[PDB]
Amino acid sequence: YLMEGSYNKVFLAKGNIPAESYTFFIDILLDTIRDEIAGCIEKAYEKILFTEATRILFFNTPKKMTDYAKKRGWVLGPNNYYSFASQQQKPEDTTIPSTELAKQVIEYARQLEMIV
């Protein structure tokens, strides 16, 4: 579940109780899990209600979710509103290529001119 983002992995961190020493240590991972989840949700949606965000990042209270809607920087209207940072400014410039592709062309010429 960790490598290919699938969640229900926070739920199975208290269900891996057959060995208690697992449940003591695994708690550490649960602060990275929230981070990857919000990392995708920053791009995956654009309008959800606040209580749902509280149900997704596995929080129980509204207060926590205010703090974490403040670190990522979202606004608190009736539904929690997003900011477009998925492809905010597109790569519509091949002026950035420009120099690089010209290097490449030159390179081909070197291989067609060298003495081999």
Partner: protein
């Protein structure tokens, strides 16, 4: 071709100075003018040797043959003139290709004397796929860089 000549006293030659018209020149041998050089070199004149003086100012002058500050790299052919060029060549590639397969089946079943004297319709062999690819490529590669370079230069 440029020589130099000086007449020699034929009279003195008759009088015994015939082996005495040898001034100390270096040498390098001639032939087709042995017509009048057998009594020219050896009776009427002889061969002087030619040199040159290649100044560095004249050399830096003649060396000039292109004023390019408006030529290539500040230009490039028309991109509809340039697709009509590729079209034609890369079709000729096809025509030659077929004959190329037909040559690779032949050469296998023959001795190099018969592939040697093969000089009827030079259109078949490698020689034309090379003849093409080096014009095509050239063109195009650079065809290639010219566009890119201007994109930054006149950005």
């Amino acid at each position: 071709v440029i020589d130099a000549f000086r007449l020699i006293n034929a009279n003195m030659m008759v009088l015994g100075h015939e082996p005495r018209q040898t001034t100390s020149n270096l040498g390098h041998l001639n032939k087709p003018s042995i017509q009048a050089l057998i009594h020219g070199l050896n009776r009427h004149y002889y061969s002087i040797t030619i040199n040159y003086r290649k100044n560095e100012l004249e050399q830096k002058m003649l060396l000039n043959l292109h004023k390019k500050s408006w030529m290539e790299g500040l230009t490039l052919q028309d991109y509809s003139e340039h697709c009509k060029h590729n079209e034609s060549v890369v079709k000729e590639m096809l025509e030659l290709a077929k004959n190329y397969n037909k040559a690779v089946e032949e050469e296998d079943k023959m001795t190099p004397e018969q592939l040697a004297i093969k000089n009827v319709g030079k259109q078949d062999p490698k020689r034309h796929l090379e003849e093409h690819v080096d014009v095509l490529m050239t063109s195009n590669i650079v065809q290639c860089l010219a566009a890119m370079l201007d994109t930054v230069v006149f950005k």
